[PDB]
Protein: Major capsid protein P5
Amino acid sequence: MKIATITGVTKSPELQVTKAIGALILSSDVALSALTTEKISIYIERGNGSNVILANKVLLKDFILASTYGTENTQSDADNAMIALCELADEGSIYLADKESIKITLEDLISDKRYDLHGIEEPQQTNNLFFFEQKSVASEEFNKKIDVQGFDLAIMTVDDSVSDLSYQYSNGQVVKYLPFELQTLSRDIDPIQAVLSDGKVVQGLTDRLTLPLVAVVGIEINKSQGSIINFVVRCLKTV
Amino acid sequence: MKIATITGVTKSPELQVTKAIGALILSSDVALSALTTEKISIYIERGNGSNVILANKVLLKDFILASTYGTENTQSDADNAMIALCELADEGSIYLADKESIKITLEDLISDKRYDLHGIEEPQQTNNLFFFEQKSVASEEFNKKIDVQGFDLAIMTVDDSVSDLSYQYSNGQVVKYLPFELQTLSRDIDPIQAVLSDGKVVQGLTDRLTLPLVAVVGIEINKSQGSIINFVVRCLKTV
Amino acid sequence: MKIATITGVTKSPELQVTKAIGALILSSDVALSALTTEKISIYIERGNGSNVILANKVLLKDFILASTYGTENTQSDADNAMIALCELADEGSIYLADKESIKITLEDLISDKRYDLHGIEEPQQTNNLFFFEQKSVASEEFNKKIDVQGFDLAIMTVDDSVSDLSYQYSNGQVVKYLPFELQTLSRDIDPIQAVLSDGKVVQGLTDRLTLPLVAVVGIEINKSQGSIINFVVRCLKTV
Structure:
C-alpha cells in the first residue's frame, strides 16, 4: 500500500504502519549514485518500551545496496529515476500481535526532491527479521580488526587510503586482499548493480563496495590516517 | 532446421512439420516493442483422432513474453532486430506416435516485414506440453474475478485505468496490489526483458506486464470504464 | 597479490609463483574484442613426478571466454578497459608441497599497450585442475568428427565456410544445427557476455562462439574447403 510521499520538507514525520508488511518499496526522482546524506530509521514498537530496532539512522545508499544484492537490482522508469525493493523478513512478513506498529522515519532529505514509500503485504507470517548494524574506525589509527561472525553481507566505504583487507575464516586461514582484487571478486557474483532509465547499466558504485561473508570470522583493515571507514553489516535472526 | 521465411504477403500458409521439434525460434527485423497485431497459431494434427490445440490466434508479443520469462530474454543481431526462442515441451521434443504433425500459421502480418521460423529438436521425447489460454475483461464493466488455478504465468495488458489487482491464494488470504507495486515485484525476478542491437537494454514493455503466479487461485481486477483488459495465461500438462 | 605489469615489451618474462593461488585476474587497457594475437602459457613444475601442462600457448580471447561463461562476465573500470577473472582450480587452489611452483608467461603482445597479472588465493587446497586443449580442422577437409567426451565447454571461431555442426549425445541420437541456431541456443544460457565502460553491454563476439557441451560425446563439423577451424576446449580432472 501507499505508505507515504515526502516533498519539500527536509524530514519525514513519524510514519506508522499497523497492518503486517514484509517489504518496502523506496522510489525517488534522484538517481542512486546521487544519494549523499539521506538516512532511514525503522523500528517496531512492542509496547511499554523494549521496542525492536531494525535500522537506526542507516544511510539510504547503504540500505539499498545491502538489500538488492544478487539476481535483482535497482529499477528505473520514465516517472521515477530510482526504485528499490528492500525486504524486512526472511520468507513472509512481520507479525504484530495486539498493539505493535512499525515506525519509519526519514532524515537529512533534500529540500527540492521527492520520495515515496510503499509497503508490500504477504500472505505468510514469520519471526525471522533482518537487522542492520554499523561499524567504524577512529580515523587516527593505522589498522583495526573487527569480528563479522554471523553477518552474511557487508557494505564498506571506498577510499584511496585503504591499503590491505585481511580475511580470517573459520578454519584459521588468513588471506590478504587489495581493493582492486576485492572489487573484482565482488563483481563476480553480482555483475550488474543498477539499470538506468535511458538504457545504460552501472555495474558498481564508485565509493561503495559489497562484500559477501561466507565462513568468515574476522576482518582486518590496514589503512592510513585521514578518513573514516564505515561498514554496514546485515544479519538475519529470530526476534 | 529452417521452417519458412515470410515477406511481402500478410498471411503465412499453414506450414507443416513432420520432424519432432522441441522449440521454435522467431526472428524478425522489427523490435519486440514494435509488434502490433501479428498472431500465431500452433497445433498438433492427428490423422485419425482429435486435434491438439496449443495456441489459437495468440498475439505474437504475448507468446514471446510468456516463453521468454526468466534468466533468458530476447536478443538481437545485425541482420535480425528481434530473435526469440520459445519452448513447446518441458524438457524435450514433442513425441509423434503414428500420424502426428505440427501445424503452424502466422496471420495479420505487415506487408513490408520479414518473419522467419526455425525449429529446434532434442534427443529426448516427452509428453508434457505448454498450453496458452486467453481471458478478457470488458470495458463497460467495473470489476471482475477470474480463476487462475493451475496456471503458473500470465501476461496482462497495461492501461492507465486499472485501479487495483487482488490476489487470492490457496490458503484463503487476500492481498491487494497497486499496478506500480505489481510492476516492481514483476521486475524483481527478471530484471531485463530484452537487449537491443546498439547495446541498450529494455527492462519491460510499456503496455504489457508479466505476472508469475505461485499458489494463487483467484485474480480480481478493479478498474474504470474505457478499455478492455486482456490476460494470456500459460500452463503445462500431459496429452 | 600482484604478479607482474607488462608495458613496452612484446614478450613477458617468465614469471614464477610459489604461493598457492586459486585464480588469475587479467587486466588491460585493450578491449576484449580488440585482442588479436596475445597468448598465455601456464604450467606447474613439480619435484616429484611429471610437470603439469595446463595451458600451452592459448589465445587470450579464448582463454578469457572459457572462464567467464555462466553468470560471471568480464567487466571494466575507468583505468582498465578489460578485467577478467579466470579460475584455475575447481573450488580451492592448486596444492604445492615443498618446492613445486607455477610458471606463467605471455607471448605476442603489443609494444604500446599495457597488461597486468593478479593472483587470488583460497583458504582451501584441491587437486582438481582445469585443462585447456586445442583441436584443429584443416582447410582441405570437407567434414571432421571429434570426440568431446569428458569436456564441458568449447569455443569456436565463427566462419562463413562452416555449414553444419552435429551433436552426438550419450544415448546415441545425432542432432544437426546451423550456426544461427547454435548461436541462439548459446545465448539462452549466458545472455550477456561483457559490459563496457560507457554502460553498453555486449552479448557476444562477432568472431567467437561459445558452446556448452552437456551429455555430448561427439561433435561433427561439415563445411566447405578454404578455411581452417580452431576449437578451444576446457576440461576438469583430478591430478
Chain C has two domains: 2-131, 133-238.
